[PDB]
Design a protein around this ligand. Structure first.
Ligand SMILES: OC[C@H]1CNC[C@@H](O)[C@@H]1O
Ligand SMILES: [Ca+2]
Ligand SMILES: [Ca+2]
Length: 769
């Protein structure tokens, strides 16, 4: 490996061998079918709302999130980088696809598959990833850095459906070597969203843009139709000419064939026919190829950028709504703009790399933080782009000032912006893209008084219930299978109109967003103030026994949606106390004396009764009325965690919080698989895991990272990082369960999981407040 020296991969990059088999992988631990795409994953490419493409550590373009809200794992075998090399003086060169695998059927049988083991590495530090190729039959060593311009405080480039592939080639030998690198791509129009004749009318064209000192050559892969539909648009791949390289291309090869039309050219001398052909196809799949060829002298290095763009301007949801994706603001809506997006990338990628470096450097250069922590912090952000992210720039047929946004809870539970989850999972948005965060919270504010009297069947008990009650915050903002932003509360396992955490979490999120954007956005507090008051006033009505605290109802009426709480709970009770203190503060900022006085009175009464009802001398009891009411809950003090972040001071005595946190670390962490797997949710005071529900026996990744955050603010530095380390280890480490770029909600003591690709563990960013 002499190529590593020639590029700059950070030490904290996650790394794995190209072609590596992983032995330990976990699987779903639930009864019904659950997504399991295997451990062959990688960092995604694509902006927010663009649709993303997961290129795996083996090289294949395999995890397709181009249909917004859907996860489709299938390798499109024509989509590759390939290399040709010939030592000057030798009769023949060698040609190899850079993919550690081969097609299932006989398509593309002419190409050279099965990139060998122990011949290169994959690295990831999102939004960047790298591959290195160190192969005994490739005398020239190669690496690529790939990325999309995901940039905090930037709402433009961050939206782009584009990826850059910056290649570095180095000749460590004493002979001249001829090298080609070829990017192939299938014309994927009709891959989704087309009911019949999936390739019909697809055609490819070549663009040569020769603006002095800036030749770009690209393929644009589209369809003859000018229709404005979810399926229609264009893909483009291309390359920018640099000194010392020549470009060649082939417009059209058949992907539903043996591939020799292309491969007989490439394998001879690494130079393609430059044959243009815009003939549309009927049944056959087609693709395009772009290649560079160059001679490297001994000791010579060369750098060459390729790019990929996809202009699929319309997203369609299952309920029938069609929306334009955010990036269309910058490139147009007609679906014929892939070349413009590609060109922008090829001409500005250096600038984008520098902008990425500028936002990673403050964390990477901090030598007080261990590498593993850096690995997790950056790579968890994969989910912001990969989470079925929807970001609209107008309804098709319908202009507003705002662009509605949604991030999925996950794909198995297909709900946008699940609020009880986003309480944990929205930290990166508030910290790095706060205009999006504020928009999402205004979306919730606008729903508070919506009343929908139509009925639905509650999954857990079969009872009928009202869809949406006036003054109750919705669970979510719809599903990709139905009508995001339009039909709320897609979730039906429990009735969220009687949840005891949603209204208080809402208020806490409002005040968080004010605090963590510098306590200046008085307009945001004004916009949301009525919804805040309404939310708390409605929750106060659920206090049955007049202790000043809402009563959990002996059913799962909060985020732990199969784990019953009854009476006053530590979890919902602490959130209530914190939310009251937040509303007091807002009342003070907005000079609303009536509200300040009311919420202060409610707070004093509730605080006093919470302490009396739950403090047992060592920790806060789980609740007042359940069978296992004295279980130690990892999340028992969630309200105080948020109160620290919001700078609301002590809602509970310092001495008691410190004792509780130490108890959680001693039991829920250290007595669960020796503290190597996070914080189990529920532990009995005898040191055995609480068995009253599956959720008690799970570690929740987002709960554990948040707990680590809480511990860190309270000066329990070692406990905080040791707690978080188990989540890192299980996700990323060789000794873990292989969940990289699909961090799940939860795992049990055996390491098996529930709900891969989950929003909650984005809470790791709370460790950086
Ligand atoms: O794993 C628990 C989660 C399942 N889906 C709905 C959420 O409200 C819940 O926290
Ligand atoms: Ca270290
Ligand atoms: Ca009560």
């Amino acid at each position: 490996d002499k190529i590593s020296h020639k590029i700059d991969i950070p030490d904290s990059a996650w790394t794995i061998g190209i072609g590596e088999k992983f032995k330990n992988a976990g699987h779903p631990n639930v009864k019904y079918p659950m997504i399991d795409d295997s451990y062959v994953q990688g960092a995604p490419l694509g902006g927010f709302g663009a649709g993303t493409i997961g290129r795996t550590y083996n090289g294949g373009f395999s995890r397709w999130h181009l249909e917004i809200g859907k996860n489709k794992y299938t390798t499109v075998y024509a989509n590759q980088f390939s290399v040709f090399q010939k030592v000057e003086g030798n009769k023949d060169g060698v040609a190899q696809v850079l993919y550690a695998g081969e097609p299932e059927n006989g398509y593309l049988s002419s190409w050279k598959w099965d990139y060998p083991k122990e011949s290169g590495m994959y690295y990831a530090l999102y939004p960047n990833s790298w591959y290195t190729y160190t192969n005994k039959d490739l005398p020239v060593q190669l690496a690529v850095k790939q990325f999309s311009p995901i940039i905090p405080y930037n709402y433009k480039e961050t939206s782009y459906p584009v990826a850059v592939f910056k290649w570095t080639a180095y000749n460590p030998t004493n002979k001249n070597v001829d090298v080609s690198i070829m990017f192939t791509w299938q014309n994927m129009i009709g891959f989704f969203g087309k009911q019949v004749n999936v390739n019909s009318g697809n055609f490819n064209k070549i663009i040569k843009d020769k603006s002095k000192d800036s030749e770009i050559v690209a393929a644009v892969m589209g369809n003859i139709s000018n229709d404005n539909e979810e399926w229609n648009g264009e893909y483009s791949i291309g390359v920018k000419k640099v000194p010392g390289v020549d470009i060649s291309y082939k417009a059209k090869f058949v992907t539903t064939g043996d591939g020799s039309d292309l491969w007989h050219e490439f394998s001879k001398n690494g130079i393609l026919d430059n044959k243009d052909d815009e003939t549309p196809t009927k049944q056959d799949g087609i693709g395009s190829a772009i290649a560079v060829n160059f001679k490297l002298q001994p000791g010579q290095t060369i750098e060459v950028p390729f790019a990929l763009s996809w202009d699929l301007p319309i997203m369609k949801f299952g309920g029938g709504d069609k929306w334009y994706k955010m990036y269309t603001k910058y490139f147009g809506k007609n679906g014929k703009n892939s070349f413009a997006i590609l060109k922008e990338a090829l001409n500005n990628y250096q600038k984008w790399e520098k902008m990425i470096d500028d936002w990673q450097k403050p964390i990477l250069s901090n030598k007080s933080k261990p590498d593993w922590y850096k690995t997790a912090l950056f790579n968890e952000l994969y989910y912001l782009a990969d989470g079925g992210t929807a970001w609209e720039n107008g309804k098709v047929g319908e202009k507003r000032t705002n662009n509605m946004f949604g991030l999925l809870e996950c794909f198995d539970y297909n709900y946008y912006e699940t609020l009880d989850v986003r309480f944990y999972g929205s930290f990166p948005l508030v910290m790095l893209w706060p205009d999006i965060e504020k928009q999402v919270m205004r979306q919730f504010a606008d729903t508070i008084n919506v009343q929908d009297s139509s009925e639905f069947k509650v999954g857990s008990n079969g009872a009928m219930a009202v869809k949406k009650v006036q003054g109750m915050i919705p669970h979510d903002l719809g599903s990709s299978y139905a009508l995001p932003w339009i039909k709320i509360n897609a979730y039906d396992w429990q009735n969220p109109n009687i949840w005891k955490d949603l209204n208080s979490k809402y208020v806490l999120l409002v005040y968080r967003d004010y605090v963590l954007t510098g306590k200046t956005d008085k307009e945001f507090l004004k916009y949301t103030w009525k919804s805040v008051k309404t939310a708390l006033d409605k929750l106060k009505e659920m206090d049955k026994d007049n202790d000043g605290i809402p009563d959990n109802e002996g059913i799962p009426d909060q985020t732990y949606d199969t784990w019953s709480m009854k009476g006053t709970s530590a979890y919902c009770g602490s959130l209530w106390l914190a939310a009251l203190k937040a509303a007091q503060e807002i009342g003070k900022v907005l000079k609303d004396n009536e509200a300040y006085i009311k919420y202060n009175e409610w707070y004093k009464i509730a605080q006093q009764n919470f302490e009396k009802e739950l403090w047992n001398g060592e920790y806060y009891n789980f609740d007042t009325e359940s069978d296992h009411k004295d279980s130690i809950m990892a999340d028992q003090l969630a309200g105080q965690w948020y109160a620290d972040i919001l700078r609301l001071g002590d809602i509970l005595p310092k001495d008691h919080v410190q004792k509780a946190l130490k108890k959680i670390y001693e039991f829920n962490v250290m007595k669960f698989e020796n503290g190597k797997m996070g914080a189990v949710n529920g532990m009995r005071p005898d040191g055995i895991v609480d068995e009253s529900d599956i959720q008690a026996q799970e570690v929740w990744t987002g709960v554990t990272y948040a707990l680590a955050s809480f511990m860190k603010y309270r000066g329990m530095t070692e406990e905080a990082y040791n707690t978080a380390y188990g989540v890192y280890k299980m996700t990323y480490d060789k000794s873990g369960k292989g969940y990289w770029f699909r961090t799940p909600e939860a795992w049990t003591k055996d390491g098996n999981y529930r709900a891969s690709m989950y929003m909650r563990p984005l809470s790791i960013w709370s460790m950086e407040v």
